[PDB]
């Protein structure tokens, strides 16, 4: 896949290490300074400004360039960009934790709030489960709001031992929108916890403190739950849409960045200009906002960040949410090729394991056969035959990884085949296919049938193999998928073939029988009362194809 050979060894993914991005790495990796918010028009002149999308990231206009990386569009994944924020911001999805952590550690000196000294604590440090330590720890010290300096050791409650210092009272905390607030207790003291602060307190937390709390010194240090540098997904994640030329077509995402950007610069230009001290934190919320909505948009703090036209805004998160999206609707299930669908009808003249494919499709669907002395002959004929007659083919591909389109190519009728080449040919009588009918909730909702190219337009399946698929002919449709590797078919014929499914394990009994006519009729035909004379008995005999020819 992709094409073009690479001297790079090739492996399978075996482990997936989930980490968090360190603003330091984010930079390293990036190839884009991303300072400007505009898209292109270097003063209307078409191209792209070394500002947003392409200060070296991926590209468009069908033009090699991608940091010389050439290859162009197809085969050049996105190249991340970064964009130095102005002031630290929260990570919409982490907020929940960033909070719980502070309630777990007190500021000023930044360190745990319960050491080996407290016993209930011990039992909470043996637990080998991030989800469980961090959930037990939290519950155990979310209540304590005083940075103890001296506690009664394993001996006398009389004798007091010393550890860390700074009893600066611990403030309870609550979540207001995208900011954290806490009081310090006669009468309270309410102040806003500046990101700039939290960040700090985390930076200082101890190495064995990280870990003690559900974390990991190398892949995910708390101090990273707070964004400082922002990775910039490259075109392919937020591609455009061109209506030829002199028009637009930008992608939703490529706007929120546009916003985040604007909202970033406006800020900065205040900390270096007429900075009315606390008329800034009115624009630092805006950043915190965008850089939050960019990732999530279905919050409880209402404002949807409706984009002109009142259209919602597809937050990154929204792209993966269950069903119709990436994970479930793009990865666990996809649209596929070498597949077809039409109406189904009975046809008591097909073997159970067969399936009537209409000529229309047999000529459309193709199978890649590899030229071999065993076939060459046959194959060259299919190729000679063209892509219009039935038994034929429609594509020859040589080692040189080049497609010969059999319907054009001044060489159509020509062509000598070469052992090694492939000849995408038409599906033929007896090509094992995977047939099926949705909803699929059985091994049997998908079985393998022998193909039988037939006229007229409908998949014609044998009757008995109905109840498994659970289908009627009142206008029902079914899907057919076509194998591709000599080994793929093998997997269908050797484990999916209808004959094998006859006995169902779901209820340790056969799962296909005899219905309607055949059944009804098989009874009449039985009766003592029922007698058959020669003239017919002879024909009937002839019908059973394996009749030993013994009247």
């Amino acid at each position: 896949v992709g094409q073009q050979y690479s001297s790079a060894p090739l492996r399978t993914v075996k482990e997936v290490q989930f980490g968090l991005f360190s603003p330091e790495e984010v930079r390293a990796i990036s190839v884009a300074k991303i300072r400007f918010p505009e898209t292109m028009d270097e003063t209307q002149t078409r191209a792209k400004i070394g500002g947003l999308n392409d200060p070296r990231l991926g590209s468009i206009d069908r033009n090699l360039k991608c940091q010389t990386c050439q290859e162009g569009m197809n085969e050049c994944p996105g190249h991340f960009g970064h964009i130095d924020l102005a002031k630290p911001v929260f990570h919409v999805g982490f907020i929940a934790k960033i909070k719980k952590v502070c309630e777990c550690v007190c500021m000023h000196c930044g360190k745990l709030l319960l050491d080996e000294h407290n016993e209930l604590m011990r039992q909470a440090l043996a637990i080998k489960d991030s989800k469980k330590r961090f959930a037990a720890i939290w519950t155990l010290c979310k209540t304590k709001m005083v940075c103890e300096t001296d506690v009664p050791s394993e001996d006398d409650p009389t004798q007091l031992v010393s550890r860390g210092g700074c009893g600066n009272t611990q403030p309870t905390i609550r979540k207001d929108g995208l900011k954290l607030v806490g009081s310090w207790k006669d009468e309270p003291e309410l102040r806003v916890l500046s990101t700039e602060e939290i960040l700090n307190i985390f930076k200082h937390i101890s190495v064995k403190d990280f870990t003690s709390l559900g974390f990991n010194e190398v892949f995910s240090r708390p101090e990273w739950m707070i964004l400082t540098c922002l990775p910039v997904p490259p075109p392919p994640v937020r591609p455009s849409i061109s209506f030829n030329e002199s028009q637009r077509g930008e992608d939703d995402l490529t706007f929120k960045l546009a916003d985040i950007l604007k909202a970033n610069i406006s800020l900065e230009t205040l900390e270096h200009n007429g900075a009315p001290h606390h008329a800034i934190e009115e624009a630092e919320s805006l950043l915190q906002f965008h850089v939050a909505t960019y990732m999530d948009n279905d919050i409880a703090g209402q404002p949807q960040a409706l984009q002109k036209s009142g259209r919602p805004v597809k937050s990154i998160r929204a792209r993966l949410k269950g069903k119709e999206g990436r994970i479930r609707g793009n990865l666990m299930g996809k649209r596929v090729d070498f597949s077809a669908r039409t109406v189904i009808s009975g046809d008591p003249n097909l073997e159970l394991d067969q399936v009537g494919v209409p000529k229309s499709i047999a000529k459309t669907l193709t199978y890649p056969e590899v030229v071999t002395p065993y076939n060459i002959d046959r194959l060259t004929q299919l190729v000679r035959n063209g892509p219009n007659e039935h038994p034929g083919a429609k594509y020859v591909i040589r080692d040189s990884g080049d497609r010969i389109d059999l319907r054009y190519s001044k060489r159509a009728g020509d062509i000598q085949l070469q052992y090694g080449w492939k000849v995408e040919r038409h599906i033929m009588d007896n090509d094992p296919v995977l047939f099926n009918r949705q909803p699929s909730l059985h091994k049997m909702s998908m079985m393998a049938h022998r193909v039988k190219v037939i006229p007229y337009s409908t998949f014609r399946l044998n009757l008995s193999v109905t109840s498994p698929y659970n289908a009627d002919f009142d206008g029902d449709e079914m899907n057919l998928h076509v194998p591709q590797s000599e080994e793929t078919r093998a997997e269908l014929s050797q484990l999916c073939a209808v004959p094998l499914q006859i006995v169902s394990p779901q209820s340790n009994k056969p799962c296909m029988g005899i219905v309607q006519d055949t059944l009804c009729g098989i009874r009449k035909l039985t009766l003592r009362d029922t007698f058959i004379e020669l003239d017919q008995v002879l024909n009937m005999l002839y019908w059973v194809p394996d009749w030993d020819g013994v009247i």
Binding site: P9, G19, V218, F219
Partner: protein, 177 residues
Amino acid sequence: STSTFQTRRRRLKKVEEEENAATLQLGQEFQLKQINHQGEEEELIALNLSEARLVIKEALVERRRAFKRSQKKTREKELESIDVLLEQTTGGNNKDLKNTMQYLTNFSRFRDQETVGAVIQLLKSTGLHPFEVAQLGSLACDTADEAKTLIPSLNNKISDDELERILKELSNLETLY
């Protein structure tokens, strides 16, 4: 590439790659404690020229042999005698090997796998480290200064006097031409 007998668990932060010097700190792939395929430990493999000349030859030869077990179904004098062995069992595009055989065979200091044997039986009583027990074998040396200076890794691991006897017995074994 060509993997090397040991899977150093690289935990993201690949940074520390020290210096390569005659402080005997050679790249990780050359600690004196490396691993053999059988799964054992094994002192590094220090080859002094003219000792390598014999090992390359040894195989390049035993190659020619088993390269025919299947075909059934004096200075300037060695320059020719080797070019052939190559044009027989080499890649013919191993311009490196060629150039390694000249170098290896011109600057060599021993012709007898016997003489080369004693060289080794001698130096291997030092307890010195391999790299040293190599530079010592392929480098002329009259004084200890000409030695412990062109091999600073020695300086304190041996008395001048001693390392000096060894050098005496070197120019004594140093095969003629």
